[PDB]
């Protein structure tokens, strides 16, 4: 049995829910009903009061991390820091017990904030850092000193794919994907930021997300470029140099990328798996029936198996679920980011930022955080990778120029004309 | 057996393609949308007295990815090409996405719908927009984002389009 009702305060709405459970011993008294008092909506100022309330950690447990991870969609870092300082200095005239309580919470909140989103803190927050520094010295608050310290502290032959062992290729691609995924700033993935990328004035919006997509596109390009005998000269649909290739030779390139993809699957670099798979399933490569005909059945089985993994079926359930010879190879992960971007854009359109009264609709922020939180921990997992750059494979990767879609469609028709 | 209509939605990231999917699939309970579930983009709908399921695949947020759409189109049974009436860029990209799905299908008469979404700053006119749909031998429907007008129309008219195609043998 669960009792649920709403309450209101200063400038915020709260929903209280109490779930009574049955006892351990079947004859024992009822255990105290699990209480939960979550902020539903409120003004910015009210959020900060809820954030600096001592009760919040134990009741509305996900509020603090949710607010810190999503606040850039309705505020700025400097401002949020400002309000925390605003509320602290306002408690200077308060009874000294309550000031000591809130200061403690403020330290806790700001430590966690720095630990999980360090790139939030830069030159922009200098004034707020001074105010807090001065606040702590005036109030006589006695890691406090640790927090201040840590805050202050803030042309390549495409056919040469064959010349490298596939497992080494996968390692090398993972390295590029892993660093970019570590450089990913999750808040930039928020629907209200990423969804507005194409609007004029937003060309340098979400740069860490774009780099993830650009690396995906280089790999897809590499595969398509490599399977065709194709090297890009310029932007023109005819500005391509083509290596002559017999169908069995072209099959080996196909099998090469299938093995690469499988090795990426072994490393759990799902981003690159999907880049390779997509490229091999793209129209100028899917057309090459003679090439596929020369492909070993073993290779086609693996390929089919890789394709089923990244199918759109049942909202990508098979790829969504997977997240949930060699020496000392650390365990990592690189997810395909697109699925997360789809969720966040979709989630951005499902709710308005504000309620009719003008309150910040925190309901939306909690849902957004459920996705942001997950890729935050996948970044933690991603740090378990331990790989070293191979300069030759790297060099081959950088001098590699993807074709345009018009170039790849034209070449595909040259090397294998339609019957 | 039980029919399943698979519709694909194309357009530039800013046409509110997401708003069209959510408003269609979810009515009074749009807030209870879970983006991760397997059911998320599947609705058991009554099309012309016939009991049928629909699947909607939306490229929302994923418009910058290179190869992924080729497999979305191959094979998707229905197609909705969405453009914003207020801008010229997204209406110009209609030509890019039109040939793009044809570069994957050898079918001229494949189930298709050209649609304008989102009037105070409308740069495009209903005369120059109709001069592209009927030239592609395809019906044109004007939709509004938040008003819920012609929302069910575009998803029902396209489902009949592929119902007509599934019969053709």
Swiss-Prot record, chain A:
UniProt domain N-terminal Ras-GEF: residue ranges: 35-152
Domain Ras-GEF: 165-418
Keywords, in A-Z order: Guanine-nucleotide releasing factor
Keyword hit for Hydrolase: no
Gene Ontology molecular functions: guanyl-nucleotide exchange factor activity
GO biological process, one term: regulation of Ral protein signal transduction
Job of this protein: Probable guanine nucleotide exchange factor. Putative effector of Ras and/or Rap. Associates with the GTP-bound form of Rap 1A and H-Ras in vitro.
Quaternary context: Interacts with SAMD9.
Full protein name: Ral guanine nucleotide dissociation stimulator-like 2
Organism encoding this protein: Mus musculus (Mouse)
Designated gene of the protein: Rgl2
UniProtKB/Swiss-Prot annotation, chain B:
Positions annotated to bind GTP: 11-18, 58-62
Pfam families in the cross-refs: Ras (PF00071)
Subcellular location: Cell membrane; Cleavage furrow; Midbody, Midbody ring
Keyword match Plastid: no
This enzyme's EC code(s): 3.6.5.2
One GO molecular-function entry: GTPase activity
Presence of the UniProt keyword tRNA processing in the record: no
Membrane topology recorded in Swiss-Prot or TrEMBL: Lipid-anchor
InterPro entries hit by this protein: P-loop_NTPase, Small_GTP-bd, Small_GTPase, Small_GTPase_Ras-type
Catalyzed reactions per annotation: GTP + H2O = GDP + phosphate + H(+)
Keywords, comma-separated and alphabetical: Cell membrane, GTP-binding, Hydrolase, Lipoprotein, Membrane, Methylation, Nucleotide-binding, Prenylation
Motif Effector region: chain residues: 33-41
Chief localisation class: membrane
GO biological process: border follicle cell migration; defense response to Gram-negative bacterium; innate immune response; negative regulation of innate immune response; negative regulation of JNK cascade; positive regulation of epidermal growth factor receptor signaling pathway; positive regulation of stem cell proliferation; R3/R4 cell fate commitment
Gene3D superfamilies xref list: P-loop containing nucleotide triphosphate hydrolases (3.40.50.300)
GO cellular component terms, A-Z: cleavage furrow; Flemming body; plasma membrane
Family statement: Belongs to the small GTPase superfamily. Ras family.
Name of this protein: Ras-related protein Ral-a
Native organism: Drosophila melanogaster
Gene encoding the protein: Rala
